[PDB]
Amino acid sequence: MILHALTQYYQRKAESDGGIAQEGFENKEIPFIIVIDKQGNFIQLEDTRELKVKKKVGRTFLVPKGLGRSGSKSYEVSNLLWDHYGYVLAYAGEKGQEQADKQHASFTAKVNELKQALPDDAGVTAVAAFLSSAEEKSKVMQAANWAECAKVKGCNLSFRLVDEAVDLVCQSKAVREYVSQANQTQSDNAQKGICLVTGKAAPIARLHNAVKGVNAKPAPFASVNLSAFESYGKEQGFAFPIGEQAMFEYTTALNTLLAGENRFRIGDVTTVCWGAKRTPLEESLASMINGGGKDNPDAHIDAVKALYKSLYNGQYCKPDGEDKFYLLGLSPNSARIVVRFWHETTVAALSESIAAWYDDLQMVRGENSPYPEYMPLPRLLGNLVLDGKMENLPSDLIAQITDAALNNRVLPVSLLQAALRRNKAEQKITYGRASLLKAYINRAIRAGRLKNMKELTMGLDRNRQDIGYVLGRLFAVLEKIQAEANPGLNATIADRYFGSASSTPIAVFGTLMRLLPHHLNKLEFEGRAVQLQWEIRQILEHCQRFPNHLNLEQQGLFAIGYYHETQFLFTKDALKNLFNEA
Amino acid sequence: TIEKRYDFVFLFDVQDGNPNGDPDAGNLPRIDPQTGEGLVTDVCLKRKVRNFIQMTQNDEHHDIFIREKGILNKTEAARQYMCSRYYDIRTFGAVMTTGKNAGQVRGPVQLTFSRSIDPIMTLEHSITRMAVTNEKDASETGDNRTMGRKFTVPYGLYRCHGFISTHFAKQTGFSENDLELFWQALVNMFDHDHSAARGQMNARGLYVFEHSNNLGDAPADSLFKRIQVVKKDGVEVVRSFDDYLVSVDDKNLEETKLLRKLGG
Amino acid sequence: TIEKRYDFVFLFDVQDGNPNGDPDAGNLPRIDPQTGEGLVTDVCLKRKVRNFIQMTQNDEHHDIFIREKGILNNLIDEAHEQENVKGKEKGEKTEAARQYMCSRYYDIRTFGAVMTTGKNAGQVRGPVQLTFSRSIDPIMTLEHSITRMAVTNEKDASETGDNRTMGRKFTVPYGLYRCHGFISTHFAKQTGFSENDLELFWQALVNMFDHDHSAARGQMNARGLYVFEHSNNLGDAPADSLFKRIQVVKKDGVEVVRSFDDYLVSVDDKNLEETKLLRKLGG
Amino acid sequence: TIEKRYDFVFLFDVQDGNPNGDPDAGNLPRIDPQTGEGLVTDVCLKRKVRNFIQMTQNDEHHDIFIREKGILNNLIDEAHEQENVKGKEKGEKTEAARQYMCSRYYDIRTFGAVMTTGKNAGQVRGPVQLTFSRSIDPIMTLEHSITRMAVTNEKDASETGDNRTMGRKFTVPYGLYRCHGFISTHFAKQTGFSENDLELFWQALVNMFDHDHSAARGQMNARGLYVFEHSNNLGDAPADSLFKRIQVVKKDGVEVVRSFDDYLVSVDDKNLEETKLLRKLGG
Amino acid sequence: RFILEISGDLACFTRSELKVERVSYPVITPSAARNILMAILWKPAIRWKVLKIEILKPIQWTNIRRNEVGTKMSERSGSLYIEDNRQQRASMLLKDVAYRIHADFDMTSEAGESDNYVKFAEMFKRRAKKGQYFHQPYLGCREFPCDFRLLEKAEDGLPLEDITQDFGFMLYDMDFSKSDPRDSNNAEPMFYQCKAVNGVITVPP
Amino acid sequence: GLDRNRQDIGYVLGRLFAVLEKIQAEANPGLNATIADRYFGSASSTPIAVFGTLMRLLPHHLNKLEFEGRAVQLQWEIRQILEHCQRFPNHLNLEQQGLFAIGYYHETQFLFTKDALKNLFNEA
DNA sequence: ATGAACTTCAAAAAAAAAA
C-alpha cells in the first residue's frame, strides 16, 4: 500500500490532465536553456528561473527522465538531450577537464545515435551539428548571462530550436515517440516477474529513478545498494521486483508532489499529501458537476493542509472524515528517503493528535476575548520567547514542541521552565502560557510522567486539593481583589510578588494575606468583598499548610490555577452564583 | 556446542545518562510514542556484549568481527573457520557472503527490544561548549560557543529478553564456555561500557531459564510473566533498585526448568 | 599506563548558588521533576579539572584544551603537521595522530575529545568516564531575583527614568550531589593514561572547588572521595552494590538538610575487602 | 598581579532595615523558606564596593561603572575607539580590547562585566568571585508598614482630600550574614589584578557599610573579615573545612540574638597554620 | 489446520521496497508466518503453507531510526569497523500487534521414511502448546520475538471487524523451487490482500 | 476543611484571630474598619502585642452581641482552639507565618456555615 | 574472483503566525 497508492493516484493525475510525465519523462527543474536554429549556431541562453526568494534551477520542464548515472565512469551513461553543463559544453567548474570532457564526448555519441535512429526532424539535426562544431559551444561560454550559470552548480542545459516558441527539442512530436519507445523497448528487456506495486507482468525495473525534494539531491525512494542491503542475492533493484510502468510512475509522482502545493512540513519533516480514491459521488451532487466528479489527486488535500496549517494558525475545527487522504511522511537522512508517517485513514483519524493537543490546550476564556478558542502555535510560543517569536530555541521549542503536538507525544519540561520564566518575568499570565502548562500536565498524567496529581479540566477546578493549584487560585483572587480596589493599578501585587509566589509560597503569601484585608476594606461594595473573602476561604480550605517551595510541576499548577480563577472571576455571573449557593 | 535452551529475562536500568537515544529527532531516548516507556534497542545490548568480549578476551577464538575503530585500535569450510575463530559469530550470528542459505548464520542468541517497565522521562539536558569545531557561520569575534544537547533519563528499568537455542549452537559452535562468557558479559558489561553520554548503567537480574530439553519445554510469554517487575508500594516514582519489586515466581518451573539467578 | 580499576564515589554539595544550570530551562539547575533531587552533569567537573590543570601546570605534553580562542580544526591541523604529515597511508595515520594527541593532550587522555573534523584522526574511547551527579534529599529552588542599575543595549523600554535590567539569579540552599564514575584500563593502555596522570586527576577532583568559582555558582565544596581500587582488569562484583554500600540518607528527625551536620554518610567497609582497596582523598 | 589565594570569611549583620531585598517577593529580604536564615546576594556588596570606590578615588585607570544613564553599548563603543579600532583582525582585537578595559576599569578587574553586546570584545572570567551570604540563626521578618500623607498620581488619589499612600517597609532585627568568597590567581594575572587593587578591595569591603546607607536598608555594619592568605597557586586543603573552622553559633541559653553580645564567634586557628596565613581587617 | 496466535510488542515485517528504511508491512507477512511455523518445527519432509491471517490488534506505526551496518562479512576483510560502515536505517515498527495465523503443511519430495502427516501435526501441536521451538519466532525481524500461543478456535478480540483498508500486493512467499539444497537463487511471487474484512486469506501456489 | 488537632502554633493563632474577627463582625453589621484592617498586619509576626488588646476587647465584643448564647459558643470554640496553644510566641517562623493565615481562613470558613459550630458545641 | 575505498552523480527547505 506504500507504493501502490502512488501508482493509483499517478494513474488518476495522468488521466485528469494535471500536467505530469507520459512514459519516460520527468518534470525536471532545468535552469538555463539553449536556443538554436535548424543547423546549430547558439543564439541566446535564456533562463526560466525568477520564482522564490531562493533562486531555484529554473522551471520544471517536461523533459525525458534521467537514466540515473552516478559512478566513476558516469560519462558513459549520459541522458537524452538534457543533462549537465559539463555534458553539453565540456566545461567543469569544480570537476576539471577529461572527467567532464568524456561526458560531452559520450553526450555527442548519444545525440548522434538518436539522430541516426530518428532522422528528418529539423530539431535533432540542429543539435547534432551544434555538438559537432567545437565553436558554437565555446560561444555559449561567452553569452550575456553565462556568468550566472557557472555560479549555481548543476546547471542543466536543454536545447530548444527556433520556430517553436516554448516547444523544446526533446518535446517535439517525433522525440516524444522516441521516448515512449525507449521505455517500451530497451526498458522492456530486463528481468521477468514479478511486480510488487502493480503485481502484474512487466519487466523488473533495475536502477530506480531519483526523487527530487528530499535530501541534498534527487535520490531514489526504493534504493537498495550495498553489500549487506541485498536480499536473497538479488544485488540492487531486484530485491524489490518493481516494474518500469510502476517505478517510473511513482518516481515521477514523488517528483511532482515534492515541487508543487502538496509539499508541506509537519514537524521538521517534509510530507507530501494527496487524496485517495474518492467516492463515486452521489447523484444530487454529481448532477451539478459536469464530467462528472473527476478523481483528482491534489483536490481535497486542502482540508488536511489547512489543518496542519491551522495548528500554526489557530483556525482548527473538529473535522468529519469519511474522505481518506494519503500522507507519505518522507524525511531526509543522508541521501535515503526515510518514511516517518503513513496513514491511509481520513482527516478525522489524522487529526486525532491535533484534537488531543487543542483539548489539552483548551483554557478558560471570557466574553469578547481577543484570543481565539484555539491559539496558533507561533502565537502560543510568543509567550515563551524574549519579546518577538524568533528567540526561541531551535531544538527543543520551535523544533520539538511542534513535533510533540502534531504526533500526540509527551511535552518536554522545557515548556514548563520557559512558561514559568516568562510568567514570573512578564509579571502576568496571558492566554498562551497557562494553556501550555495545562496541556503539559494533562499529557504527563496520560503518559505516566505525573502520579500524585490529576488531569485538569477546561473550567475552574474548585476541588483539586493540590498544594499548587489552590495557591494559584489564591494569587489570582488576591490580584483580582487588589484590582477591584485600585482601578488604575501600575505596580500591582502581581508584578512585585509573582516572582516568588510561584516558587516560595510562605514568603509571598505571608504578606499578601496581610495586604488582603486592607484591599477588602478599600472596596466600595462590601458585598463584593464578602463574596471574595468567602471564595478565598473556599480556595484555602483545600490547602492544609503553605509549603516551603513549589516544585516544577507545582509552579505549573500555580499558573494554571491562577488563570482559571482569574477567568472564573471575570465571568458574567459566576462568583455571585457560587457565593449564593452556600 | 551446548545442549539446553536458555530464555533469560535480562534486567538493566539507567541511573543518569542516555541509554539508547533516537536519531529520529537528534538523540532523545526512543520512548514509546503512546505510553511513554523507553524502548532501548537490543542492538545496543549486543554491541555492549561485543565490547565487553573485546575488552576481556583479546585473543583468538573469541574475536568480534563487528568491532569498533575507536574502542580497539569449501563453502562450509570458511563458515566453520569463522565460527571457530570468532565469538560474535557463534553468539548473535553471522553472514558469510559465500555461505549457504543466501549466506546466512542465524545464531542462537536472539535478543529483544528492551522496553522499560515504567514510562521514563526524557530529560532534555542541553549542555553548552566553550569551543566550536569548524569555522561556524556564527563564530564571529566574541566567544566561540556551540549549544549542545544530551538527553538524560532519571530512571528506567529496561526489560530485555533472550532466546538461546542449542539447535543453532550445534552449527555455530556456541559451547558452554561461550555461554558462560555471555553471562559474565551481561553481568559485568555495564561496568566497563561507560561514557559521558551513556552515564551510569548496571545489571539487575539475569534470570536465566535453563530448559532440560533441547526444544525448551516452556513458553516465552509464561517465562516472562513469571518475572514480575512492577513498582513498589509507597514509592510514587522509581529512582533506584529500592523502588522496584522484581518478585520472581519459581513455583511452577520446579519440574524441569532451572531459574538461574546469575545477576539478581 | 594504569592497571587497576577505580570506582570513586565523588560527593560534593553547594552552599548558595547555581551549580550545574540548565540552558534549556532559563537559569535553573537540573532537578528531578518527579521527585526533586538536584542533578549535576559531569562536564562541569571536567571543566573544573581542566581549569585546575591550566592554573597548576603550564607545560608541554599536557595540553589543557584552550577556551574561547581555540578552534578545534586549527588545533587538529597543527597536530597533523608533526610526524605523520602524509607519509603514513591515511588509515594508520589517523591512529598515529590519535596516539600523538593522547601523548600531548591531557583532556583527551583522561576524558576525550572529537578529532573527526576536517583532517580526521580517529576518536578516543576514553578511560575515565564520569557520570551525572544526583542528590538524595529533594532540593528546592530558591530563585534569588536581583536587579541592575545599568541598562545594556538600547532597550525599547529604557525610557527616561532608571535604566534598569533585573532578571533572575537562581540559588540552591543545599544538595549533596552523589556523583559516580568508573575508570577502565584497556583504553587507558592505548591512550597512555599513566599513574601520574591518575594522581593529577585525583588532585584536580579534590581541589577544583577551591579555585573554579563564580558569582552564579556561589560557594561549592567537595565532601568525600572514596575510590574503590581493584586488583585486576576483570570483574569481581557488580558496581551497583559497591556504590550502594556508601549510602547517604537523612540523620535524625529533620525535614531538610542545611550543612554537613544534617547528613549521616554511612560508610561500612565490610564486604568490599575481598580483592579491593579503599582510600580517602577528599573526606 | 597577585600570586596568593585569599579565602576571606566576610561577616556582616543588620540593625534595623531591609538589606538585600527580593524583587521576587514584594519588599522582603531573601530568607530561607525551610528554616528561616536570611540570605544576602553578593551583588549588593559589589555595588557597595563600587560606591565606595566612586566616592574615594575620582581618577583614571580605575573606572567605576557609572549609574543609570551609563549605556553599556556606548561605553563599549567608546573603549573600542582607542588603540584597536580595526587594525587588529577581530579575534585578537577582542582580547586586546578586553585587556584595555581591564587595565582601565576596576569593576571588571575585580569582578567582571558583560562586554559582548554590539561591538564584541570578549568576556572576563573574573578573579575575585564573592558568594551569596547566609545567616545562622533563623531570622524573623518584622514588616514595618508605614504611611504617607501625600498621594503620588492624581488617578489613585482618593475622591476626598485625605490623600494617603501607605504600603510596607520591611525591617530585620538581626542576622549575621556569614558571607563567603574565594580569590583566584590565574584570571588575576590576565586581568591585571595587582596587590594595590586587592588592598583597595579589602578597604572597600571593610568600610562600605559606613557610607552606602539608605532608609530601606537602615543601619548595617561589618563584623569581621578573616582572610585566609595561602602560599602558592595550588590546592592545599579543601576550603569547606577551612571555612568551617570559623563557626558562628549561639551563646548561652538564649532563643534569638539581638547584637554582638549574643553571638560567640569561635575562632580556633590551630590546624590552618600549615602553609596558610591569617589577618584581621574588620574584626 | 492450526490456529496459532502470534503476539508481540513490536514488529518489523520489512517491505521488500523499503529495506534501506525498514518500513514494516501493514500486517504480518505470509512468508514471515511460514518462517515462524518452520522455526517452531520444520524438517526436510514437512513443507509449511500459510492459509489465512487474522489480525487481532490495530495497526500502530512507530518510527525507530536504528543504526545498522551496510557491509557484509566474508573471508576477505577480517574486521568490519562500523565507524566506516554506519547505516542509519529507519524502522517504522508496528507497536502492539497480534495475529492468529491459520495454516497447515504438506510433504516435500525428500520426505524420507517418516512421512506421516499426523506425526508432524502432533509434534507441532505439542511444541506450540508446551512452548518448544527450533528457533524463537520473529515478527518480521529477529530483534522482536513472538509470544506465541496455540489457539483451538478464538481466544482474543479483533479490531478489524467491518470492511477496512486493502493493503495491495504484499510479499506472499519467495519462490525457492529453482533453488538447490540451502537456497541461493530465488524469485518473488506476490499476491493481493483481496479485502481485510476480518481475517485475510492467502492464495496457495 | 479544618484540622483542630494539628498541634501547630500558627494554626491555632490564625483560628483565634479568625474567631476574633468573626465576633467583631457579629457585634455590628455596619462595621467599616474591623480588626483585620489593622490588627492582622502584624498578627503573624508580633502576636504578643496584638492578641493582648484582642483578648482585652473580646469580652466587650461578646457583651455587644444581641444573643448571649452566641457569645458562649464563641468563647467555647475560642478555648477549644487555644487548647493546643500552650504559649503566645514572640515571632512566628515562615512555616508558622503561612500556617497563621491557613488556620485563619480555615476557621473563618468553618464559622461562616449553617450547622457546624453549633453541632460541634452540642457534643461538649 | 570480489569487498572496502574511491569517484562521480544535485548543488535543498522555508513558513510556522493570526480573529
Side-chain angles (χ1 to χ4, degrees), chain A residues 486-546:
Chain A
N486 272 303
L489 253 170
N490 161 267
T492 67
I493 55 155
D495 309 349
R496 299 183 291 105
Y497 284 99
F498 188 73
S500 191
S502 175
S503 58
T504 304
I506 50 178
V508 162
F509 292 127
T511 75
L512 271 199
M513 283 308 185
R514 265 145 135 159
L515 283 175
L516 181 57
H518 327 301
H519 311 337
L520 296 163
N521 193 18
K522 192 178 160 60
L523 293 190
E524 40 102 22
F525 278 164
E526 203 61 42
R528 181 63 186 185
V530 160
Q531 299 174 178
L532 293 151
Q533 206 165 27
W534 171 89
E535 73 155 328
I536 200 162
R537 287 160 30 211
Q538 294 282 151
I539 284 164
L540 208 51
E541 142 182 7
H542 323 313
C543 180
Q544 275 306 311
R545 58 159 295 272
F546 275 139

Side-chain angles (χ1 to χ4, degrees), chain C residues 173-213:
Chain C
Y174 207 57
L176 182 58
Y177 301 116
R178 190 198 187 142
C179 176
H180 311 289
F182 303 124
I183 302 182
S184 57
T185 60
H186 198 173
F187 317 124
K189 289 178 234 207
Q190 314 186 336
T191 62
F193 198 62
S194 37
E195 291 90 349
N196 203 38
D197 304 318
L198 181 94
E199 284 281 333
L200 286 171
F201 173 62
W202 289 134
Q203 289 170 8
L205 267 196
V206 162
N207 309 290
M208 61 192 204
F209 286 121
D210 302 348
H211 310 88
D212 205 303
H213 275 266

Side-chain angles (χ1 to χ4, degrees), chain B residues 100-148:
Chain B
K100 299 309 280 176
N101 329 301
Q104 86 150 0
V105 175
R106 256 171 299 186
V109 189
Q110 167 170 348
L111 249 55
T112 302
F113 266 41
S114 304
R115 168 172 257 94
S116 167
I117 290 305
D118 291 331
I120 70 159
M121 191 160 203
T122 296
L123 292 196
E124 299 85 6
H125 277 159
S126 275
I127 44 183
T128 324
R129 187 164 50 185
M130 307 191 103
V132 300
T133 51
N134 210 14
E135 300 295 325
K136 209 56 182 176
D137 309 333
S139 74
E140 218 51 52
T141 86
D143 39 359
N144 300 326
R145 325 178 65 87
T146 162
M147 193 58 243

Side-chain angles (χ1 to χ4, degrees), chain A residues 52 70-71 99 103 153-154 217 263 265 309 313 379:
Chain A
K52 198 61 194 304
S70 305
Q99 207 272 311
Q103 296 174 357
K153 310 163 289 300
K217 35 191 299 306
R263 187 180 180 275
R265 310 184 196 111
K309 195 174 300 180
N313 271 18
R379 202 168 169 256

